[PDB]
Amino acid sequence: GSHMKMGVKEDIRGQIIGALAGADFPINSPEELMAALPNGPDTTCKSGDVELKASDAGQVLTADDFPFKSAEEVADTIVNKAGL
Numbered sequence: 001g002s003h004m005k006m007g008v009k010e011d012i013r014g015q016i017i018g019a020l021a022g023a024d025f026p027i028n029s030p031e032e033l034m035a036a037l038p039n040g041p042d043t044t045c046k047s048g049d050v051e052l053k054a055s056d057a058g059q060v061l062t063a064d065d066f067p068f069k070s071a072e073e074v075a076d077t078i079v080n081k082a083g084l
Contacts, residue, residue, distance in 0.1 A: 009084035012052050013075045015045035019053070020071035027068035030058035050083075057082030 020027055023036030034054035037043040042055040060081035061068075068074045 005084070006050075008047050008050070009079055012045040012047060012050075012084065013079050015043075016052070016054075016075045016078060017071050019043050019045065020074060023071075025067075026070035026072075027074045029063070029066035029068070030054045030061055033068070033071070033074065034058060052079065052082050052084065054078070 019037045019039075020033050021036070022038070023033040025032075027033040028035075034042050037054065042053055044051050044053045044056065046052065057078040061074075061078070068077070
């Protein structure tokens with residue numbers, strides 16, 4: 001449970017939440033939610049050196065993950081599995 005955390009956990013996740021905004025339902029699986037991303041070809045919320053996004057991190061999310069509990073849960077979920 002204990003973790004130092006750099007700080008951007010919320011910062012990148014911030015980019016993820018907005019990055020998710022626009023998709024079909026509030027996060028139609030990485031396919032769609034990632035499709036919504038403002039950048040188009042899956043935006044990367046990288047900072048300083050660390051990189052996080054639906055493509056790089058979302059990989060952890062399986063098919064059943066489709067009906068995600070809104071972008072809010074996706075942001076916290078992805079960062080957790082991805083590292084943050």
